[PDB]
Amino acid sequence: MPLVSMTEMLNKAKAEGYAVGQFNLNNLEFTQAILLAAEEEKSPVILGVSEGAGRYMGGFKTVVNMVKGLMEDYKITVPVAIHLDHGSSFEKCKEVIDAGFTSVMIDASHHPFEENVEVTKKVVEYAHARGVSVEAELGTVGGGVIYADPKECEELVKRTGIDCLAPALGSVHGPNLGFKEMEEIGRITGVPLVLHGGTGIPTKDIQRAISLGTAKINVNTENQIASAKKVREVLAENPNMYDPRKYLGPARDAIKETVIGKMREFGSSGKA
Amino acid sequence: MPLVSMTEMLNKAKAEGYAVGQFNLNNLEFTQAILLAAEEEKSPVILGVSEGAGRYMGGFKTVVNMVKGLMEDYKITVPVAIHLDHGSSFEKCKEVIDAGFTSVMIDASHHPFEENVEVTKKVVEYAHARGVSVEAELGTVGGGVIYADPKECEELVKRTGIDCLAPALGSVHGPPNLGFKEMEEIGRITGVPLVLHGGTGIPTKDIQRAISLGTAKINVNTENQIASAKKVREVLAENPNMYDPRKYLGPARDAIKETVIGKMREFGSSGKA
């Protein structure tokens, strides 16, 4: 029932000087872990879903249904967003919104600037009509880093009316950030900033990025690492184990503890 | 194509001489595997949910929501029931039905017979009001094996109006000597589809015999857990640096599916949707 867009949690995070974690959904245990960490920490949270993840989990309707189910069964009170991560097209954002997502990222960063503005603006028109928040990216985040231009950032936000921006400034996916650019994209843009590739990034870079307008930090890989590591440990200690709950439960608890750590480091804990 | 009760699929299976597999849900990958197997095989299926599994998956509303989602997202066309495995009380069966289950099993055998009739009949009134099928169990399935009394089975069916009966006659949970004499008698005297728990160990000859004598529902859980865990162990050994969950639970999902497909061909559910 507390399913919301990102707009308000991110605007209050920026004003108050903490960040909200986006933690990526890969399956049921992932979703459970993230929501339980959010409730335990009384922290706002963003449930990130890549196109790949949506597909692996069967579809976006299945994801929204599963989240609403857990939201009822665990009686979640904290603000919770369901956010399309790295939306590849307008059509993807529309499908995801029609499924009941509260938030979309449209990533046309690998396209020319003007062609990015066209599709990002189109997504903002569709989403804003439905109470859906919209994130956009300029520059390229590694997985291959191409820096975002602060005046390009200014123009994209003025032109589209997005609710937050993801300026690529050295961040990389999997396991050296431009605070000079980030600080004044923050000043020049006046919207909450999004930091991709959250895995690896030190508490010190995290807090400094917060200080200069980053209000959303994306974490996926850290949870995959903690979960797979716990699964390995439990299957190794118990070679006779076949009950999926007896090794995916521990993995869920590992994900939960990782996410709690991130929520405390970002300062979302106690802000719900 | 919404969800259906067990009543029609089980009566049809009994008349035609096949059985429908109940395959137990443990998480998203399990549910995905079972529904994809059913659709691939054009076979009816029953999604079993223990009390334990229901809690593990967050709650009964989450389980129904996730199943509805997959049925829309996978465009499932075959009949699909959502069935509570081993309901302990009327309260549990009511909770599960209010969540959107299409089927419940109530076992009040650990009660005097008249009080057992009370609880099962209450469950039947509540469920039949909502198009929900009711299974009942007599005797105990091992993991403590006590055969079901055939006249107890007959009187319970006659008195409650349950749609199917699960007579414990030597079945055990996990990874064979079943009372086919008593099963023939309970099937003939009750006139309802019979249910066989502990499907995992039981060999093909015992399975086909049970079907021949009116067993129309077979419960399978441990086999899928074994297939999944074996595939995960293989993948994690061969890929020491893997952390992406989709890369070991993905293959495991496929293992579960092939497992379920095997059972669907063995039970004769394949092509009967």
Side-chain angles (χ1 to χ4, degrees), chain A residues 109 113 116 136-140 146-149 152-153 156 165-168:
Chain A
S109 265
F113 165 68
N116 176 306
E137 186 176 320
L138 291 143
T140 289
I146 327 163
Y147 263 54
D149 172 60
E152 217 147 286
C153 292
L156 178 61
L165 189 70

Side-chain angles (χ1 to χ4, degrees), chain A residues 183-264:
Chain A
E183 185 259 306
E184 261 177 85
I185 298 159
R187 218 222 84 156
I188 271 50
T189 314
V191 302
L193 294 188
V194 182
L195 179 61
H196 288 234
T199 313
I201 307 183
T203 288
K204 69 96 150 218
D205 290 279
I206 282 304
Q207 295 162 344
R208 184 158 178 194
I210 305 183
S211 211
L212 306 178
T214 297
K216 176 173 177 285
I217 299 157
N218 295 11
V219 183
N220 185 14
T221 286
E222 196 151 342
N223 301 324
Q224 302 180 13
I225 285 168
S227 80
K229 165 167 167 181
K230 185 59 147 214
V231 161
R232 289 174 186 284
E233 178 258 37
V234 168
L235 290 186
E237 309 251 33
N238 313 260
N240 294 321
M241 184 179 285
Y242 56 73
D243 184 358
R245 299 170 286 171
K246 308 272 238 299
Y247 60 90
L248 294 185
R252 175 179 58 216
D253 299 330
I255 299 165
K256 190 188 81 168
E257 225 68 68
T258 306
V259 173
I260 287 162
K262 289 290 142 171
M263 289 173 168
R264 270 166 212 188

Side-chain angles (χ1 to χ4, degrees), chain A residues 27 29 32 56-59 61-62 65 69-70 72-73 224 228 232 235 238-239 241-242 244-245 248 252, chain B residues 26-27 29 32 52-53 56-59 61-62 65 69-70 72-73 225 233 236 239-240 242-243 249-250 253:
Chain A
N27 69 15
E29 285 90 345
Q32 288 177 318
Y56 172 90
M57 292 184 275
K61 266 287 322 197
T62 302
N65 272 18
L70 293 178
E72 173 148 13
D73 286 324
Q224 302 180 13
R232 289 174 186 284
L235 290 186
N238 313 260
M241 184 179 285
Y242 56 73
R245 299 170 286 171
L248 294 185
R252 175 179 58 216
Chain B
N26 285 103
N27 69 12
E29 286 91 348
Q32 288 174 316
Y56 172 84
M57 295 183 275
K61 210 157 330 298
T62 304
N65 267 25
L70 288 176
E72 172 185 335
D73 273 325
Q225 298 176 4
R233 282 184 191 283
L236 290 185
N239 304 256
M242 181 181 286
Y243 55 74
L249 300 178
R253 184 189 51 212

Side-chain angles (χ1 to χ4, degrees), chain B residues 158-216:
Chain B
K158 293 207 276 151
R159 286 232 263 156
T160 60
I162 54 170
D163 307 278
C164 67
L165 184 89
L169 299 167
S171 299
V172 301
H173 298 282
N177 54 320
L178 283 160
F180 298 108
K181 214 218 192 65
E182 291 68 28
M183 219 191 83
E184 210 203 316
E185 255 303 290
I186 298 168
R188 301 315 320 227
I189 66 169
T190 55
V192 295
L194 292 199
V195 178
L196 180 59
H197 290 235
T200 298
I202 300 160
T204 309
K205 76 170 179 75
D206 293 288
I207 290 298
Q208 294 302 331
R209 176 138 170 181
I211 295 165
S212 81
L213 299 175
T215 292

Side-chain angles (χ1 to χ4, degrees), chain A residues 140-162:
Chain A
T140 289
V141 173
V145 166
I146 327 163
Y147 263 54
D149 172 60
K151 278 227 120 209
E152 217 147 286
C153 292
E154 185 213 87
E155 185 146 344
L156 178 61
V157 177
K158 306 335 182 83
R159 265 158 152 237
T160 59
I162 52 167

